[PDB]
Protein backbone atom coordinates (compact mmCIF):
# COMPACT_ATOMS: atom_id res chain seq x y z
CA UNK A 1 0.00 0.00 0.00
CA UNK A 2 1.47 0.74 -2.19
CA UNK A 3 3.20 -2.45 -3.40
CA UNK A 4 6.63 -2.46 -5.27
CA UNK A 5 6.93 -4.24 -8.11
CA UNK A 6 10.17 -3.61 -9.67
CA UNK A 7 10.80 -5.51 -13.24
CA UNK A 8 14.35 -6.26 -12.84
CA UNK A 9 17.05 -9.20 -13.76
CA UNK A 10 16.49 -12.27 -12.03
CA UNK A 11 17.30 -15.90 -12.07
CA UNK A 12 14.60 -19.17 -12.48
CA UNK A 13 15.26 -22.60 -11.36
CA UNK A 14 13.54 -23.67 -14.55
CA UNK A 15 15.30 -26.91 -14.99
CA UNK A 16 15.11 -29.30 -12.77
CA UNK A 17 17.29 -29.22 -9.25
CA UNK A 18 20.65 -29.83 -9.64
CA UNK A 19 20.70 -28.38 -13.70
CA UNK A 20 21.84 -24.63 -14.39
CA UNK A 21 19.44 -21.79 -13.19
CA UNK A 22 18.37 -19.41 -16.05
CA UNK A 23 18.81 -15.38 -16.08
CA UNK A 24 15.35 -13.44 -17.45
CA UNK A 25 13.78 -10.91 -16.27
CA UNK A 26 11.50 -10.56 -13.32
CA UNK A 27 9.43 -8.87 -10.59
CA UNK A 28 11.12 -8.59 -7.10
CA UNK A 29 13.77 -10.80 -7.00
CA UNK A 30 11.96 -13.48 -9.23
CA UNK A 31 9.65 -14.89 -12.14
CA UNK A 32 7.05 -15.81 -11.51
CA UNK A 33 6.53 -12.53 -9.98
CA UNK A 34 4.76 -12.27 -6.99
CA UNK A 35 0.91 -13.80 -6.17
CA UNK A 36 -0.71 -10.20 -6.03
CA UNK A 37 -4.26 -10.28 -3.65
CA UNK A 38 -7.13 -7.95 -2.59
CA UNK A 39 -10.80 -8.89 -2.13
CA UNK A 40 -13.26 -8.16 -4.40
CA UNK A 41 -14.33 -4.32 -4.30
CA UNK A 42 -10.86 -3.24 -2.51
CA UNK A 43 -8.31 -1.11 -4.35
CA UNK A 44 -4.87 -2.64 -5.59
CA UNK A 45 -2.07 0.39 -5.34
CA UNK A 46 1.28 -0.70 -7.26
CA UNK A 47 4.17 1.44 -7.29
CA UNK A 48 5.58 -0.06 -10.91
CA UNK A 49 9.52 0.51 -11.11
CA UNK A 50 11.51 0.14 -14.30
CA UNK A 51 15.30 -1.89 -13.80
CA UNK A 52 15.23 -3.55 -16.99
CA UNK A 53 16.71 -0.94 -19.13
CA UNK A 54 14.01 -0.16 -21.76
CA UNK A 55 10.63 1.12 -21.97
CA UNK A 56 8.06 -0.50 -20.16
CA UNK A 57 4.32 -0.94 -18.31
CA UNK A 58 2.02 -3.15 -17.17
CA UNK A 59 -1.29 -4.83 -18.20
CA UNK A 60 -3.77 -6.35 -15.59
CA UNK A 61 -4.53 -9.36 -17.91
CA UNK A 62 -9.09 -9.06 -17.33
CA UNK A 63 -9.49 -6.69 -14.97
CA UNK A 64 -12.29 -4.75 -16.06
CA UNK A 65 -11.08 -1.63 -14.37
CA UNK A 66 -10.24 2.34 -15.00
CA UNK A 67 -9.04 2.80 -18.61
CA UNK A 68 -6.27 5.18 -17.32
CA UNK A 69 -4.67 1.73 -15.51
CA UNK A 70 -4.87 -0.81 -18.13
CA UNK A 71 -1.25 -0.28 -19.14
CA UNK A 72 -1.06 0.24 -22.93
CA UNK A 73 1.55 2.83 -23.83
CA UNK A 74 0.88 5.36 -26.61
CA UNK A 75 -2.91 4.62 -25.95
CA UNK A 76 -3.75 4.46 -22.08
CA UNK A 77 -0.15 6.23 -20.94
CA UNK A 78 3.50 7.20 -21.91
CA UNK A 79 5.75 4.47 -21.74
CA UNK A 80 7.91 4.01 -18.60
CA UNK A 81 10.73 4.65 -19.64
CA UNK A 82 13.87 2.62 -17.94
CA UNK A 83 14.75 4.17 -14.22
CA UNK A 84 11.42 5.54 -14.32
CA UNK A 85 8.23 4.72 -12.14
CA UNK A 86 4.44 4.16 -12.33
CA UNK A 87 1.53 4.31 -9.55
CA UNK A 88 -1.02 1.72 -10.63
CA UNK A 89 -4.36 2.39 -8.47
CA UNK A 90 -7.70 0.38 -9.05
CA UNK A 91 -10.52 -1.16 -7.09
CA UNK A 92 -10.87 -4.64 -8.37
CA UNK A 93 -14.78 -5.63 -9.35
CA UNK A 94 -14.55 -8.98 -9.51
CA UNK A 95 -13.51 -12.28 -7.60
CA UNK A 96 -11.32 -14.31 -9.68
CA UNK A 97 -8.23 -15.63 -11.19
CA UNK A 98 -6.20 -12.93 -13.04
CA UNK A 99 -3.11 -11.91 -14.14
CA UNK A 100 -0.52 -9.09 -15.22
CA UNK A 101 2.33 -9.25 -17.33
CA UNK A 102 4.46 -6.48 -19.13
CA UNK A 103 2.00 -4.45 -22.00
CA UNK A 104 5.23 -6.22 -24.86
CA UNK A 105 4.92 -9.31 -23.16
CA UNK A 106 3.11 -11.07 -27.01
CA UNK A 107 6.16 -10.04 -29.02
CA UNK A 108 9.20 -9.64 -26.65
CA UNK A 109 11.20 -12.45 -26.15
CA UNK A 110 13.36 -10.31 -23.34
CA UNK A 111 9.97 -9.91 -21.67
CA UNK A 112 9.49 -13.86 -21.06
CA UNK A 113 9.53 -13.62 -17.15
CA UNK A 114 7.48 -10.40 -16.80
CA UNK A 115 4.49 -11.74 -15.40
CA UNK A 116 2.54 -13.31 -12.44
CA UNK A 117 -0.76 -13.99 -10.57
CA UNK A 118 -2.98 -11.60 -9.71
CA UNK A 119 -6.23 -12.69 -7.18
CA UNK A 120 -9.20 -11.13 -6.53
CA UNK A 121 -10.81 -12.79 -3.65
CA UNK A 122 -14.93 -13.34 -2.91
CA UNK A 123 -15.79 -12.12 0.34
CA UNK A 124 -16.67 -15.39 1.47
CA UNK A 125 -14.82 -17.94 -0.35
CA UNK A 126 -15.56 -21.57 -1.36
CA UNK A 127 -14.62 -24.29 1.64
CA UNK A 128 -10.94 -25.59 0.68
CA UNK A 129 -7.98 -27.08 2.41
CA UNK A 130 -5.42 -25.61 -0.29
CA UNK A 131 -5.83 -22.88 -3.00
CA UNK A 132 -2.29 -23.34 -5.50
CA UNK A 133 -1.74 -21.36 -8.82
CA UNK A 134 -0.95 -23.06 -11.16
CA UNK A 135 1.39 -21.49 -14.29
CA UNK A 136 1.91 -23.13 -17.38
CA UNK A 137 4.40 -22.13 -19.79
CA UNK A 138 7.53 -23.31 -21.97
CA UNK A 139 10.61 -22.75 -22.75
CA UNK A 140 13.00 -23.40 -25.39
CA UNK A 141 16.51 -23.31 -23.20
CA UNK A 142 20.23 -24.05 -24.01
CA UNK A 143 22.76 -26.82 -22.44
CA UNK A 144 23.54 -24.32 -19.83
CA UNK A 145 20.48 -23.30 -18.97
CA UNK A 146 20.23 -19.72 -21.01
CA UNK A 147 16.95 -19.19 -23.15
CA UNK A 148 17.13 -19.97 -26.61
CA UNK A 149 7.74 -20.29 -37.98
CA UNK A 150 9.84 -21.24 -34.89
CA UNK A 151 11.75 -23.64 -36.08
CA UNK A 152 11.17 -25.73 -33.49
CA UNK A 153 8.98 -27.93 -31.51
CA UNK A 154 7.36 -27.24 -28.48
CA UNK A 155 10.02 -28.94 -25.91
CA UNK A 156 10.21 -27.93 -22.39
CA UNK A 157 7.15 -27.36 -20.31
CA UNK A 158 6.21 -26.67 -17.14
CA UNK A 159 3.36 -26.31 -14.69
CA UNK A 160 4.74 -24.04 -11.77
CA UNK A 161 2.78 -24.30 -8.65
CA UNK A 162 2.28 -21.64 -6.35
CA UNK A 163 2.65 -22.15 -3.30
CA UNK A 164 4.59 -25.82 -3.46
CA UNK A 165 3.05 -27.07 -0.55
CA UNK A 166 2.17 -30.41 0.58
CA UNK A 167 -1.37 -31.76 0.09
CA UNK A 168 -2.71 -34.37 1.74
CA UNK A 169 -5.56 -37.35 0.47
CA UNK A 170 -9.14 -36.58 1.23
CA UNK A 171 -7.93 -32.70 0.85
CA UNK A 172 -9.92 -30.58 -1.04
CA UNK A 173 -7.95 -28.16 -3.25
CA UNK A 174 -8.71 -25.15 -5.78
CA UNK A 175 -6.56 -25.24 -8.34
CA UNK A 176 -5.65 -22.04 -10.27
CA UNK A 177 -4.77 -22.44 -13.56
CA UNK A 178 -3.44 -20.36 -15.69
CA UNK A 179 -1.89 -20.63 -19.41
CA UNK A 180 0.80 -18.21 -19.23
CA UNK A 181 3.12 -19.05 -22.44
CA UNK A 182 2.50 -16.75 -25.30
CA UNK A 183 2.74 -19.26 -28.26
CA UNK A 184 1.55 -22.28 -27.05
CA UNK A 185 -2.17 -24.37 -26.62
CA UNK A 186 -1.92 -26.33 -24.01
CA UNK A 187 -4.93 -29.00 -23.41
CA UNK A 188 -4.51 -29.53 -19.80
CA UNK A 189 -5.13 -33.98 -18.19
CA UNK A 190 -5.74 -33.74 -14.12
CA UNK A 191 -4.58 -36.83 -12.34
CA UNK A 192 -5.35 -38.16 -8.95
CA UNK A 193 -8.23 -35.42 -8.47
CA UNK A 194 -12.12 -35.38 -8.74
CA UNK A 195 -14.03 -32.47 -8.74
CA UNK A 196 -15.33 -29.86 -11.64
CA UNK A 197 -14.15 -26.60 -13.38
CA UNK A 198 -15.85 -23.66 -11.84
CA UNK A 199 -14.53 -20.79 -13.68
CA UNK A 200 -13.26 -19.49 -16.86
CA UNK A 201 -11.13 -16.49 -17.24
CA UNK A 202 -12.04 -14.95 -13.28
CA UNK A 203 -15.65 -15.59 -14.36
CA UNK A 204 -17.49 -18.36 -12.72
CA UNK A 205 -19.72 -20.75 -14.65
CA UNK A 206 -23.57 -21.54 -13.33
CA UNK A 207 -23.35 -25.01 -13.23
CA UNK A 208 -20.17 -26.48 -12.56
CA UNK A 209 -18.82 -28.71 -15.48
CA UNK A 210 -16.09 -31.89 -16.21
CA UNK A 211 -12.57 -30.65 -16.59
CA UNK A 212 -11.81 -33.76 -19.29
CA UNK A 213 -11.04 -32.55 -22.29
CA UNK A 214 -10.14 -29.18 -20.63
CA UNK A 215 -8.19 -26.82 -23.14
CA UNK A 216 -6.23 -23.72 -21.91
CA UNK A 217 -5.01 -20.99 -25.06
CA UNK A 218 -2.50 -18.26 -24.26
CA UNK A 219 -3.19 -16.16 -21.38
CA UNK A 220 -6.77 -17.90 -20.90
CA UNK A 221 -7.67 -19.61 -17.07
CA UNK A 222 -9.63 -22.04 -15.65
CA UNK A 223 -10.70 -22.66 -11.26
CA UNK A 224 -10.96 -26.10 -10.79
CA UNK A 225 -12.48 -27.30 -7.19
CA UNK A 226 -11.33 -30.99 -6.46
CA UNK A 227 -10.99 -33.68 -4.14
CA UNK A 228 -7.80 -35.20 -3.45
CA UNK A 229 -8.70 -39.08 -4.27
CA UNK A 230 -5.33 -40.91 -4.35
CA UNK A 231 -1.81 -41.75 -2.46
CA UNK A 232 0.21 -40.78 -6.14
CA UNK A 233 0.72 -36.96 -6.31
CA UNK A 234 -1.70 -34.46 -8.39
CA UNK A 235 -0.05 -34.30 -11.80
CA UNK A 236 -0.82 -31.92 -14.63
CA UNK A 237 -0.63 -33.93 -17.91
CA UNK A 238 -0.34 -32.46 -21.55
CA UNK A 239 -1.51 -35.79 -23.81
CA UNK A 240 0.19 -36.35 -26.87
CA UNK A 241 0.26 -38.59 -30.37
CA UNK A 242 2.96 -39.95 -28.75
CA UNK A 243 1.84 -40.55 -24.67
CA UNK A 244 1.59 -38.06 -21.73
CA UNK A 245 3.70 -35.57 -21.51
CA UNK A 246 3.96 -34.57 -17.34
CA UNK A 247 4.04 -30.73 -16.54
CA UNK A 248 4.07 -31.32 -13.00
CA UNK A 249 2.80 -32.69 -9.72
CA UNK A 250 1.58 -31.68 -6.40
CA UNK A 251 3.15 -34.47 -3.71
CA UNK A 252 0.78 -35.72 -1.71
CA UNK A 253 1.34 -36.72 1.96
CA UNK A 254 -0.63 -37.85 4.70
CA UNK A 255 -4.57 -38.48 5.29
CA UNK A 256 -7.31 -35.71 5.80
CA UNK A 257 -9.94 -37.51 8.03
CA UNK A 258 -12.18 -34.33 9.04
CA UNK A 259 -13.11 -33.65 5.77
CA UNK A 260 -16.90 -35.25 5.27
CA UNK A 261 -18.00 -36.00 1.56
CA UNK A 262 -19.76 -32.85 -0.19
CA UNK A 263 -20.64 -31.56 -3.55
CA UNK A 264 -18.30 -29.03 -5.52
CA UNK A 265 -19.98 -26.07 -4.70
CA UNK A 266 -20.10 -23.04 -7.65
CA UNK A 267 -18.61 -19.87 -7.01
CA UNK A 268 -20.99 -16.98 -6.42
CA UNK A 269 -21.29 -15.33 -9.57
CA UNK A 270 -19.56 -11.84 -11.02
CA UNK A 271 -22.00 -9.03 -12.39
CA UNK A 272 -22.48 -9.69 -16.04
CA UNK A 273 -24.62 -7.28 -17.89
CA UNK A 274 -26.85 -9.21 -20.45
CA UNK A 275 -26.14 -8.65 -24.10
CA UNK A 276 -29.46 -7.90 -26.41
CA UNK A 277 -28.90 -6.59 -29.79
CA UNK A 278 -25.87 -5.09 -31.35
CA UNK A 279 -23.57 -3.49 -33.88
CA UNK A 280 -22.40 -5.82 -36.44
CA UNK A 281 -18.49 -5.65 -37.01
CA UNK A 282 -15.95 -7.92 -38.26
CA UNK A 283 -12.34 -8.30 -38.43
CA UNK A 284 -10.20 -10.48 -40.49
CA UNK A 285 -6.54 -11.60 -39.12
CA UNK A 286 -3.76 -10.23 -41.49
CA UNK A 287 2.36 1.26 -32.51
CA UNK A 288 -1.34 1.83 -33.28
CA UNK A 289 -3.79 2.66 -35.80
CA UNK A 290 -4.87 6.17 -36.02
CA UNK A 291 -8.47 5.20 -36.04
CA UNK A 292 -10.33 2.56 -33.72
CA UNK A 293 -11.70 -0.41 -35.28
CA UNK A 294 -15.27 1.21 -33.56
CA UNK A 295 -16.48 3.73 -31.59
CA UNK A 296 -19.16 3.11 -29.33
CA UNK A 297 -21.44 4.51 -27.31
CA UNK A 298 -21.56 3.42 -23.32
CA UNK A 299 -23.24 0.06 -22.98
CA UNK A 300 -24.05 -0.16 -26.56
CA UNK A 301 -23.99 -4.57 -27.51
CA UNK A 302 -21.41 -5.66 -29.96
CA UNK A 303 -20.99 -8.85 -32.28
CA UNK A 304 -17.72 -9.13 -33.64
CA UNK A 305 -16.75 -11.70 -36.19
CA UNK A 306 -13.64 -12.87 -36.26
CA UNK A 307 -12.32 -13.84 -39.38
CA UNK A 308 -8.85 -16.17 -39.26
CA UNK A 309 -7.68 -16.47 -42.93
CA UNK A 310 -4.08 -17.78 -42.43
CA UNK A 311 -2.85 -21.14 -41.56
CA UNK A 312 -1.77 -20.20 -37.65
CA UNK A 313 -4.29 -19.94 -34.82
CA UNK A 314 -4.60 -16.34 -33.29
CA UNK A 315 -5.10 -15.39 -29.84
CA UNK A 316 -7.56 -12.86 -29.27
CA UNK A 317 -7.78 -10.51 -26.15
CA UNK A 318 -9.83 -7.71 -25.60
CA UNK A 319 -8.94 -5.11 -23.09
CA UNK A 320 -11.35 -3.80 -20.34
CA UNK A 321 -14.36 -6.24 -20.93
CA UNK A 322 -15.30 -9.29 -20.99
CA UNK A 323 -17.07 -11.25 -23.67
CA UNK A 324 -19.35 -14.08 -24.51
CA UNK A 325 -18.04 -16.93 -27.42
CA UNK A 326 -20.69 -18.09 -29.61
CA UNK A 327 -21.34 -21.52 -30.00
CA UNK A 328 -21.99 -23.62 -32.80
CA UNK A 329 -25.53 -22.99 -32.62
CA UNK A 330 -26.08 -18.83 -32.56
CA UNK A 331 -25.95 -18.37 -29.00
CA UNK A 332 -23.92 -17.78 -25.66
CA UNK A 333 -21.09 -19.96 -24.85
CA UNK A 334 -18.06 -18.90 -22.24
CA UNK A 335 -18.38 -15.83 -21.31
CA UNK A 336 -14.13 -15.11 -21.41
CA UNK A 337 -11.57 -12.57 -21.55
CA UNK A 338 -9.09 -13.93 -24.38
CA UNK A 339 -10.15 -16.25 -27.14
CA UNK A 340 -8.49 -18.15 -29.73
CA UNK A 341 -9.61 -18.73 -33.41
CA UNK A 342 -7.86 -21.48 -35.32
CA UNK A 343 -6.09 -21.42 -38.73
CA UNK A 344 -9.00 -20.71 -41.27
CA UNK A 345 -11.90 -20.25 -38.64
CA UNK A 346 -14.09 -17.49 -37.63
CA UNK A 347 -15.69 -17.39 -34.49
CA UNK A 348 -18.16 -14.45 -33.43
CA UNK A 349 -18.06 -12.58 -30.31
CA UNK A 350 -20.63 -11.12 -28.02
CA UNK A 351 -19.61 -8.19 -25.93
CA UNK A 352 -21.58 -5.03 -23.83
CA UNK A 353 -19.18 -2.29 -24.39
CA UNK A 354 -19.74 -0.79 -20.90
CA UNK A 355 -16.50 0.39 -19.33
CA UNK A 356 -15.47 3.84 -20.90
CA UNK A 357 -11.80 4.84 -22.54
CA UNK A 358 -9.69 3.13 -25.29
CA UNK A 359 -9.02 -0.47 -25.41
CA UNK A 360 -6.82 -2.41 -26.91
CA UNK A 361 -7.99 -5.06 -29.52
CA UNK A 362 -5.46 -7.83 -29.47
CA UNK A 363 -5.24 -9.89 -31.82
CA UNK A 364 -1.45 -12.44 -31.74
CA UNK A 365 -0.58 -14.61 -34.88
CA UNK A 366 0.73 -17.82 -32.70
CA UNK A 367 4.79 -18.16 -33.12
CA UNK A 368 5.09 -15.03 -34.66
CA UNK A 369 6.97 -12.16 -33.83
CA UNK A 370 4.04 -9.68 -34.03
CA UNK A 371 4.12 -5.71 -32.43
CA UNK A 372 -2.43 -3.23 -33.51
CA UNK A 373 -6.69 -2.61 -33.01
CA UNK A 374 -8.38 -0.65 -30.99
CA UNK A 375 -12.17 0.56 -29.66
CA UNK A 376 -12.97 3.63 -28.36
CA UNK A 377 -15.92 3.34 -25.18
Same mark, same amino acid.
Given at each position: ?45 ? =? ?43 ? *? ?58 ? =?????? =? ?12 ? =? ?106 ? *? ?19 ? %? ?7 ? %???? @? ?22 ? %? ?24 ? @? ?5 ? *? ?6
Amino acid at each position: APVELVAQPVNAQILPEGEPATPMLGFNGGTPGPVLRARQGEVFDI =RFQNQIGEGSAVHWHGLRIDNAMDGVPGMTQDVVEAGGEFEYSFR *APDAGTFWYHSHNRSWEQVAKGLYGPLIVEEPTPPDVDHDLIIMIDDWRITENGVLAHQG =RLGNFA =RALVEPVTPVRRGD =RVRLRLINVATDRIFPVELEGVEGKVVALDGMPIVDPQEFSGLILAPAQRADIIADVITDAPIGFVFPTRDGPYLLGEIPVKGANTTRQPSEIPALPPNEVTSPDMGS *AVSLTLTGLTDTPLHSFERGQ %TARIRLVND %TRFP @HGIHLHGHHFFEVGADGNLGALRD %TTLVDAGETRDIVCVFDNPGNWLLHC @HMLGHQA *AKTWVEV
